[PDB]
Amino acid sequence: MFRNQYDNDVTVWSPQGRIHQIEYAMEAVKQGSATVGLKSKTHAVLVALKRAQSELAAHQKKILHVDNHIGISIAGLTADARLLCNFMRQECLDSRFVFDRPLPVSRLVSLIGSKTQIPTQRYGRRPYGVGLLIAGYDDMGPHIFQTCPSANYFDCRAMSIGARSQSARTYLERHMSEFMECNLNELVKHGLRALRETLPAEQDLTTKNVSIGIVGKDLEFTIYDDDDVSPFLEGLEERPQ
Amino acid sequence: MFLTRSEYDRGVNTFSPEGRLFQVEYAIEAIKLGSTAIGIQTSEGVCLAVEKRITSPLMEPSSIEKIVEIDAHIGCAMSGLIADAKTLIDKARVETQNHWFTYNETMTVESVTQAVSNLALQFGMSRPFGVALLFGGVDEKGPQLFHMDPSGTFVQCDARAIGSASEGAQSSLQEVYHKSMTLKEAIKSSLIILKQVMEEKLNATNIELATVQPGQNFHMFTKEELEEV
Amino acid sequence: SHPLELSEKNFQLNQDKMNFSTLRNIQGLFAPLKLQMEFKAVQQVQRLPFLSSSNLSLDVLRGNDETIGFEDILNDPSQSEVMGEPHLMVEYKLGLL
Amino acid sequence: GTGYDLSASTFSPDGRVFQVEYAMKAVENSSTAIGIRCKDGVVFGVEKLVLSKLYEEGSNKRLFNVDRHVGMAVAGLLADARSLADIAREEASNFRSNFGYNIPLKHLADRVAMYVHAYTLYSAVRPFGCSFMLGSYSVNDGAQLYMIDPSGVSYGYWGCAIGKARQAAKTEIEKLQMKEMTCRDIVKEVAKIIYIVHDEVKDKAFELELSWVGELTNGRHEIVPKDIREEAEKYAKESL
Amino acid sequence: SRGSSAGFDRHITIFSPEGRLYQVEYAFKAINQGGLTSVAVRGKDCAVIVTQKKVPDKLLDSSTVTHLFKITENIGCVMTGMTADSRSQVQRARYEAANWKYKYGYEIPVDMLCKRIADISQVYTQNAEMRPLGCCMILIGIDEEQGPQVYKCDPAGYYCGFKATAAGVKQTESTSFLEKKVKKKFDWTFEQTVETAITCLSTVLSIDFKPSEIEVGVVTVENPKFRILTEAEIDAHLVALAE
Amino acid sequence: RRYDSRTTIFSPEGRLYQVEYAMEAIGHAGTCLGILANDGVLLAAERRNIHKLLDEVFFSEKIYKLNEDMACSVAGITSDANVLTNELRLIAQRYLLQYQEPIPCEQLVTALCDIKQAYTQFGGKRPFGVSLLYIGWDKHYGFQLYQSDPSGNYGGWKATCIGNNSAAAVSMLKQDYKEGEMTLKSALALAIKVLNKTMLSAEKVEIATLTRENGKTVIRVLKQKEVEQLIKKHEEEEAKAERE
Amino acid sequence: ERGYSFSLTTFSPSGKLVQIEYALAAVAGGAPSVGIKAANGVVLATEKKQKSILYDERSVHKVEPITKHIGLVYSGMGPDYRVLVHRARKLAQQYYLVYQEPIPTAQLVQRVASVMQEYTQSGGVRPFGVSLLICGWNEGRPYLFQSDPSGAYFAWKATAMGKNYVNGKTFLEKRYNEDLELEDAIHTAILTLKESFEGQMTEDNIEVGICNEAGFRRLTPTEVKDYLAAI
Amino acid sequence: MFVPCGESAPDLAGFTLLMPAVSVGNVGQLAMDLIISTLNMSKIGYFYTDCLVPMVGNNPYATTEGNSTELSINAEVYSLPSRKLVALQLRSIFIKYKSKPFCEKLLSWVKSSGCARVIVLSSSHSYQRNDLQLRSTPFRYLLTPSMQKSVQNKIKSLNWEEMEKSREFCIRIPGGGITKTLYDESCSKEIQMAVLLKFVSEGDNIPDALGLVEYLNEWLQILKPLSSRWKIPSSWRLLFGSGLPPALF
Amino acid sequence: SYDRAITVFSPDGHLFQVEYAQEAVKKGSTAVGVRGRDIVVLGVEKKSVAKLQDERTVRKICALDDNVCMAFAGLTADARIVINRARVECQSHRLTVEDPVTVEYITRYIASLKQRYTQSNGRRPFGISALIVGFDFDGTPRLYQTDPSGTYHAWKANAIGRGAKSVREFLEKNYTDEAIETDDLTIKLVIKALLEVVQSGGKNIELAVMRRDQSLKILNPEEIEKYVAEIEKEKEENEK
DSSP, rough: OOOOTSOOOOTTEEEETTHHHHHGGGGGGSOOEEEEEEOSSOEEEEEOOOOSOOTTOOOOOEEESSSSSEEEEEEOHHHHHHHHHHHHHHHHHHHHSSSSSSSOHHHHHHHHHHHHHHGGTTTTOOOOOOOEEEEETTTEEEHHHHHHHHOEEESEEEEEETTTOOHHHHHHSGGGSSSSTTTHHHHHHHHHHHHHHGGGOOOOTTTTSEEEEEEOSOOEEEEOGGGGGHHHHHHHOOOOO | OOOOOOOSOOOOTOTTTHHHHEEEEEHHHGGGHHHEEEEEOSSOOOHHHHHHHHSSBBBBTTOOOOOOOOOOTTTEEEEGGGHHHHHHHHHHHHHHHHHHHSSSOOOOOHHHHHHHHHHHHHTTSSSSSEEEEEEEEETTTTEEEEOOOTTOOOOEEEEEESSSOOOOHHHHHHHHSSSSOOOOHHHHHHHHHHHHSSSOOOOTTEEBBOBBBBSOOOOOOOHHHHHHH | TTTHHHHTTTTHHHHHHHHHHHHHHHTTSSHHHHHHHHHHHHHTTOOTSSOOOOHHHHHHHHHSSOOOHHHHHOOOTTTTTTOOOOOHHHHTTTTTO | OOSSOTTTTTOOTTOOOHHHHHHHHGGGOOOOOEEOOOEEEEEEEEEEEETTTOOEEESOOOOOESSSSOOEEEEEOOOHHHHHHHHHHHHHHHHHHHSSSSHHHHHHHHHHHHHHHHGGGSSOOOOOOOOEEEEEEEEEEEEEEEEOOOSSOOEEEEBEEEEEEEHHHHOOOOOOSSGGGGHHHHHHHHHHHHHOOOOOOTTTOEEEEEEEEEEEGTOOOOEEOHHHHHHEEEEEEEHH | OOOOSSTTTSSSOOOOOOOOHHHHHHHHHGGSOOOOHHHHHHESSSSEEEEEOOOTTTBOOGOOOOOEEESSSSSEEEEEEEHHHHHHHHHHHEEEEEHHHHHHOOOOOHHHHHHHHHHHHHHHBBBBSSOOOSEEEEEEEEEEEOOOOEEEEOOTOOEEEEEEEETTTHHHHHHHHHHHHHHHHHOHHHHHHHHHHHHHHHHHTTOOOOSEEEEEEEEESSSOOEEEOOOHHHHHHHHHOOO | SSSSSOOOOOOOTSSSHHHHHHGGGGGSSSSEEEEEEETEEEEEEEEOOOOTOOOOOSSSEEEEEEEESSSEEEEOOOHHHHHHHHHHHHHHHHHHHHHHSOOHHHHHHHHHHHHHHHHHHHTTTTTOOOEEEEEEEEEEEEEEEEETTTTSSSBSSEEEEEETHHHHHHHHHHOOOOOTTTOOHHHHHHHHHHHHHHHHOOEEEEEEEEEESSOOEEEEEEHHHHHHHHHHHHHHHHHHTTTT | OOTSSSOOOOOOOOOOOOHHHHHHHHTTTOOEEEEEEEEEEEEEEEOOSSSSSBBSOOOOSSEEEEEETTTEEEEEEEHHHHHHHHHHHHHHHHHHHHSSSOOHHHHHHHHHHHHTTTTSSSSSBOOOEEEEEEEEEEESSEEEEEOOOOOOOOOOOOOOEEETTHHHHHHHHHOOSSOOHHHHHHHHHHHHHHHHHHOOOOSSSSSEEETTTTTEEEEHHHHHHHHTOOO | OEEESSSSOOOOSEEEEEEEEOOGGHHHHHHHHHHHHHOOOOOEEEEOOOBBBBEEEEEEOOOSSSGGOOOOOSEEEETTTTTTTEEEEOOOOBBBTTTTHHHHHHHHHHHTTTOEEEEEOOEEEEEEEHHHHHHHSSSSEOOOSOOOOHHHHHHHHHHHBOOBBBOOOBOOOTTHHHHHHHHHHHHHHOOEEEEEEEOOOSSSHHHHHHHHHHHHHHHHHSSSHHHHHHOOTTTTTTTSOOOOOSSOO | OOOTTTTOOTTOOHHHHHHHHHHHHHHHHOOEEEEESSEEEEEEEEOOOTTTOOGGGGEEEEEETTTTEEEEEEHHHHHHHHHHHHHHHHHHHHHHHHHHHHHHHHHHHHHHHHHHTSSSSTOOOOEEEEEEEOOOOTEEEEEEEEEEESSSEESSSSEEEHHHHHHHHHHHHHTTTTTSSSHHHHHHHHHHHHHTTSTTTTEEEEEEEETTTTTTEOOOOOHHHEEEEEHHHHHHHHOO
C-alpha cells in the first residue's frame, strides 16, 4: 500500500533500499518462450521453442547469428534484442577489422554488461527487458553465458530461461554429470529432453516449433530449422509416462 | 487491508508489476480503427488488397491513396493513422535512391524493411506510431512478404490480414491458403475474403489492388481491370 | 579563406577541451563531469532564440564576468541586421530542420 | 522524511538528504565482507551465498584485481560495483601513464570517492548503492586499507566490515590485537569470524572466499592457495 | 528533467508569502549535522584556526581524520558540516586558485578567493537543477600590505571579513565570549591568540582538553606559510594554559 | 481546474484558459483612446503615475515613437512593453535597410503579433500581458489605426479603447462618432468628453497627434496650456448646454 | 487557491502573477534605504546589517560605484546585488568602448532593468529579490532612479524602501522641499533614517554616499560622525 | 441501510460515534484500525450502500484459530456497549458522484438511531501551509454551533488550535474527502459534530496515525492518560509488498 | 483522464488533445467550397459586423499564389502563421524552379507542417482547418481540405466550421452535373448552400470567385444582392 510513491522511476530509492522498476523489468523475460543452453568438452548447443501460432502469419527468429563463433537466443522484448544484436555485431566487426583476431566471449559479455548498466541510473530511460543465452568457442574452449535486465551476467554449465523453465532447470541439474563426456548427438538429445519438459504432458516436439544452433572447435555457428531438425528429432524416444 | 489506486499506463518508459508496457499496447489497439487489408505470398507474385472507405459521395474517390509504391520492385499497404506513414515512406525512398546512386542495383526487400524499421524505433517523436504496414516485392531470393506493427519491429510472413476485422479474415485465409497456388487464384481468394468482410458493395471504386510479380514492374490495377473481376 | 576564420570560430570549444584535459589529468574524472553538468543545467533557461538573451548565470560560472573581448564590442548581436521568422528559428533550434 | 525523500537535491526540515540514506540502507541487503590489516599485509574475506549448482565455480566473484598491486572487495548492488571497478582501473592506468610509477592508495581512494560523491547532487541521476574496500602493500609505505560508502566518504582502517551483519563482525574483530600478528595467523581468524557470523536458518549454503596482499607475495594481490584455505576452514569449523 | 515539487518549502526557486527561501534555510541546518565546532581568531601579526577532533571508533586510523586543509602555500582552511561536500569545495577552491594564477600572473588573495566561491554558491540557489552544499568555509592568510585576514562564506552565497568568528553547533556562545574578549583587549601576541582560541573552545564546551582532541593551524608574518601544529606543541600550549 | 495550468492544453470544448487569463490582466491598466479623422489621428492616455514626489525626466510615458511615421501606446505590464517596443523599432529599421523604403503600417503589426503568438504556441514560457494601439501614415492607405491583444490578434478600427472601463467608452464612441465628417478639433473634443465620462485636470492626461505637412509627417505631444484650454472649453459648453 | 502560487509562468484567473508579489515582499523585509535628490546633488543612505564589534569595517560595502559619476544601493538580498553590480560595471565599460563617452544614467538603468525582466518569464529560475536606487550626474543635472524585481523603473525626487518605508515616505513628503542644498539633503536623509533605527545611531552602522559635479564618492566614517554631531 | 449481523438491530441511544474519512494518506482509517484493535470491539452489523468499490477479505483482527476465518466487507460497524461507544470503518474508496448520497444516507441513519455526537478523523495536504502554519502544531479541530458548552470549555482548557477559515466565510479542507460535506450537512441538520485532522504527506503514515490517536485520547480519555500501549493489528504486515528477488544484491 | 498530454494514448486507442483541437475548429464561422467545370467558388459566413471597424483587415479569404487561394475556420492567429509560411514557400519554390506551384504540392506542405506539431509534449497543435482551391498547369480545377491532425483529402464540394453538417447534407442533395454547367449557376449554388445557416442573406456573406487564367475576384455587395434577388425571384416563381 505504501509502494505507490517509489515504483514509477528508476532513479528513486525505496525506504527499504530497493528499486522496483528493475524488478519489474526482470518480469518481462518470463513473457517469452523457453530456451535451453548446454555445453560439452568440445561443443556448445542452443535449442529454442517457438510459439504455437501458425507459421502462416509469423516467421520468428529466436536464434540469431552474431559472428563466426558466437550465437545467441532471445527471451523478452524484440526491439531490445535487435539493438543488442546490432551492438554485438558492430563490436565484433570492428575488432576483426582492426586486429585479425576473434573477440573473446568474456570481453564481449563485459562490454554488454557495461552498456546495459547505464539506463538503470539515468532519468528519462528504462532498463532493457530482454534476457540472452550466449554460446561461443575461443582459445579457452566452449562457453555458455546468461544475461539479465539488471545488467548482471553469469558463467554457466547449463541454463534455461523463459516461461515455465523451472522444469527444464530441474532436469538439467539432475542430469548435469554426464554432459562433459557426451558427443554432439547425445548433447543435442539431452537438450531436447530438457526443453520438452516445459510442455503439457501430452504434446511432443515436432519439426515445426524447434530451432537448434551449434558451434564447435571446427564447426562454425549454424542454425538448423524446419526439415534440417528431423535427423536430430528422429532418435528421441517417447515420454516416460 | 485497504483498497487503493495505482497507475502504470501513462508513460512509455514505465513497466507494469507484471512486466508490460501499456502505451505500446494501446498504440497497437489503435490499429483496429482502420480498414482491412490482405496480403498473400505466392511463388509467382505478391497480391496486395486494401479496403477504401468513403464517408460521403461528394468525396473524390481518387485521393485515398493507401497503396503507395516505392522503387526497387517494392509494394506497400497501410491501416491506421494515415498521416503517420509519410516519414517512413520518405526514409524508405531516400535509402533506396541512395543505394541506386551508390551501387547501381536494387536494394533487397529485407534491407529496405530493416532500414525503415530503424526509424520507427526512435521513440524510446515521443510516442509510437499508430499505423501498420505490409511490404511486397520479388528479388533473387524470390517473392517476399513482411509485416510491421506499432511496436517498431518487422516479421516475415506469407499470408497476413490487418485492419478492424482481421481475426475472421485470418481464420478464412488460413483455410483457403495452400502451399501452391496460381497468382490469379490468390487474387480471387483475396477478392472473396474482402467481399465477405466488407459491409457494402464491391464496385470498382471501393477497393485498390497492385499485384507485383517478377515479369514486369509495378502494376496497380486500373478501373477497367478491377471492373473485369 | 583567411587563416584566422576557423581559429576565431571555435575558440571557446578548444579552450574548454584544453582546460578539461588538464583538469582530468590533475584531479580526476569527476571534475570535468561536474563542470559539464553545471554548464548544461545553466544553459537551459533563456529567451526564445529570436530574442536577445543575457547569459548571466553562464558568464558567472565560466568566469567571463570581468573580461571584455573583441566579440563584445564589434558587430553587436543585439542589433542584428538580419533575422528569420520566429517559428522557423525555434524549429531549427530543436533539430526539426 | 515523508514528503522530502524523492530527489537527491532536496533537504529535509532538519538538514538531511534521505535518498542517500536509502542508498546506504541498500548495502545491508547483501552478504557480509570483512577486511583486516596486519603487520605485513591485508587479508580479505567474503561469504558468497550459492544460488544454484548450474553456475561454474568462480562465477560472480566479489574480489577483484583493479591493478597488479591493489585488491578490491564489494558489497551491495553488483552492477554498480562493476562500474566502480572499471572507473578505478581507468584512474590507475591514467596515473601510471602520466607519472610512470604505481599510484598510491590514498590518491586512488580520493579520486574514486569524489566520483561517487558527484552522483548525490542532481535530480537527473541516482546515487550508487554499494560499498567497497581497497587494500595494498609496499615496502616503502607498508600495509594500507580504505573503505568507501555510497555518500562519498573514505577513511583509513585497521579492520573493517560491511554487509548485513557488520555489527557482530566488528564486535568480533575488536578483540584481536592485529597490530603484532602475521597474515598466516589472521587468515584463520578471518575464516572463524566469517563462520561465526553466518546464519544457517535463513541462508542455506555459502562458499568462503579469501585473498591477501602482503610481503610473502612481493606486494601482489592473489587468491589464497587451496590447502591453506582448507586448513583454515577446518579450523573454523572445529572452533564452532 | 524530473519536475519541481509543489509547496512553499519543497523547491529551491519558490518564494514564500513572506519572501523566504526555506531550502536555503534548511541547508544552513546541515552544518550542525557533524556535531563539531571550530573557532578562528585574528591577532596583531598572526591568525589561528582551532577545531575539535572526534574519533569514536577504535578500529579507525586517526591519521586520516582531519578538517584542516591547505589551499595554496599561503592560505589555510577549516571546514564544518558534511564531509564529502567539504572535500568537494576544497578541490573547487584549489582549481579556482590555479585559474587565477594562470590568468593574472600572481597568487590569488584571500578575499578574492572567498568572493569567487560565494559567487559560485549563489548560482545554485537560483537554478532548479542543482542544490547547495551543506558546509561553511573559513580562510586565513597574510596580506602583503594589510596583514592577517579572516574570512567566511556560507551556503547562501554571503561572505564577510572578521576579527574573530566561530561555526558549528555552539557558534552563539563562542561569538558572545569572543565579543566580550575583543571589547576588553586588543593587540595580542602570537601566544595570546592561541590561548584565546583554546580558552573559547574549552569554555563553550565544558571539557579539559588533551593534545589528541584538538587540531591547530597557524599563519604568521615572519613565516607566511600555512602550518599545522604537532602534538608536542599542542601539549606545550596546554600546559601553558594549565599553569 | 485540470485544464488551466499550461498554455499547451486544450479544454474539452476547445479553449485555451491561460491566454484568457493573460487577457484578464489588461482590465487593471490605464485607459487608452484612439480616434481617426480626415486630417489626422489621435491618441489620448490616462496617467497612473501620479504623486507629489515623482520626477519628470522623459519625453512621455505610455506613448512611444517607432519610426518617422508611426507611434504606439501600451497598456498592461511595463517590463514586457519595453521589450515589445524595442523589437518594433528593430523590425522597422531592418525593413528599411533591406528595401530602402519605409515599412507599411500593417506589416509591422503583423510581425509583432507573430512574436506574441509564438509565446502562446511554445511551452515553458509565459504570454505577454500587453495590449497596444498603433497610429501612422503610409502611401498605400493613408492614415490608419490598429489594435492588438496578448493572444496575437489585431484589426483595424476608426475609434477604439483599451484598458479600464473600455466598454462604456466604446459605447459612447459608437453613439457619438460620425463617419467621414470629423476633423482633428472634433476628435479632440470627443476624446476629452469620453475621457471625462470614463474616468479631470491637465496633469492626468497626455495627448499626441499625427499629421502631414508638405509631404512630411509631424508627431506632436500637446502642452499643459492646450490641454487646459480644451478642458475649460468642454466645461463651459457643458454648462451652457445644461443651462437650457 | 494555491494552485497558481508556486509557478512563475502561470497567470491567476484574475490575471495576476503571485511569485513577483512574493519577491517584492522579500524586498520589503530588508534594511531601510533612503534617497534624496536636491539641487546640485544626490544623496544615498542605508543601514548596516553587521552591527557587532567582531565584524571588520572595510571588507564588504552596501554603497558601490559603477562609474566615476554613478553609484548604487539596495534593499533585499546581497548575493543578487553583487552579480547585478558586476554586470552593470561591464555594461558601462562596453558603452564607453563603443561610443567614447561615459554612459548616461537612464541608459544604464534601462539595460539593467532589461536584464532583470528576464528571469520572470521562464521556467526553472526565480526572480531577483532585490531593489536598487541609482544616482548620477549628467549634463549638469542630477538623477535618481529605482528598479523593481520585475524590471520596471521609475524616476523619483525622494523615496524610501525597506522596512517601515511607508512612514518614511510620509516623513519625506512632509519635509522635502524643491530649493534644497546638498548639506540639507544629507541632514534630511539622516533624520529620515533615524525614524526607525531602534537603537543608538553611530557612524559605524550607517553608510552614506553622495554625487555631484565632481563625481560619486562614499563618505568616510569621520565625516559621518561630524554630520551626526551636528544634529 | 444498517443491516444487522443477527436478526434484530442493537439499541443505540446516547452512544458516541467515531468514524474516519477516506482522505490523503489513509490516516483516519489507520487510526480507526488502531482504536478498534486496542479496545477489542465486536462486530454488530454492516452498512450496505452503493457508493464504495466492493472488496472482501478475511478477519483483519485475528488472534486465535477460530476467529481468523470470518469474512469482512468494505463497511462494518463495531460497538462497545459497556462504555457507549460505536465505530464505523471503511476499507475502500468512493465512486464518482457518490460521496454526497453516502453522506446523506449516513447522517439520516445517525439522526434516526439516536446517537449523541459524532467525531470525524481526517487529514489535509501538507504542501498548502503558509509561513504561520509552518511553525505551529499540525493538529487542528472544528466544532458545530450545536455542540454542548462543556465540550467547548474542555477544548479551551486543552489549549488546542482551531482550523483557519478561508476567504460569507467558508471552510476548505484540501485532501479531506467527505469531511466538508459531512460538516455542512451536520450544521444544516442540527447535529453535534467535531472534526480532528492533521497535515500529512503521502508515504509510510503509521507515525501519523499514532500521533492522531494520542491527540484524540487527550480529550476522549479512552484509556490511561500519558505521563507499547496501542495494539498493532495482525494485518499490518507486508505493507511494502512481497520479498526481494535473488541474484541482485 | 487520458487527455492531459498530447502524446498519450487512451486504453481504446485515441489521442484526445487532437480531438479537442478539432472541437476548437468546430466553433468557427462556416466556410463552403464548390468546384465546377471552369470555375471555383469560396464563401464564408460573417459572424458579426461592428460599425466602427475597418472590414478590410478581418477577411477570411486569402491568395497564396496566382493559381491558388484558401479559406479557413478556427483560430485566427494560427491561420495567419500558416498562411505566411505557405506564401513564403510558394515564393521560394517559384524562384528556385520557374514552374508554377501545384495545388497538391502546397496542400501536402501545409499538412506536413500541421502534422509536425502533434508529435511532442512541448508544443501544441494548430486549431484550424483549411479549404484550398485552384487551377493546375493544364487547367484542371482542384479542391482540398486539411485537418489539425495532418490528414487531407480531395472533394467536389465541402463545408467546415459551425453548422457544417446541414450544409453538407444540402450539398449532397443538390450537387448535380446540371447545377454546375455555368458560372452563375455555380455561384447561385454556393449562395443557396450558405443561406441554410446564415440569418440574413447578403448582409453578412463574403464570396470569392476564381476563373481559369484569371486573378482572384472578390464579389461586391451589389453583385451579392443581385444574386440573392435572382434566387428570391426564382423561389417565388417556383412557390406556386
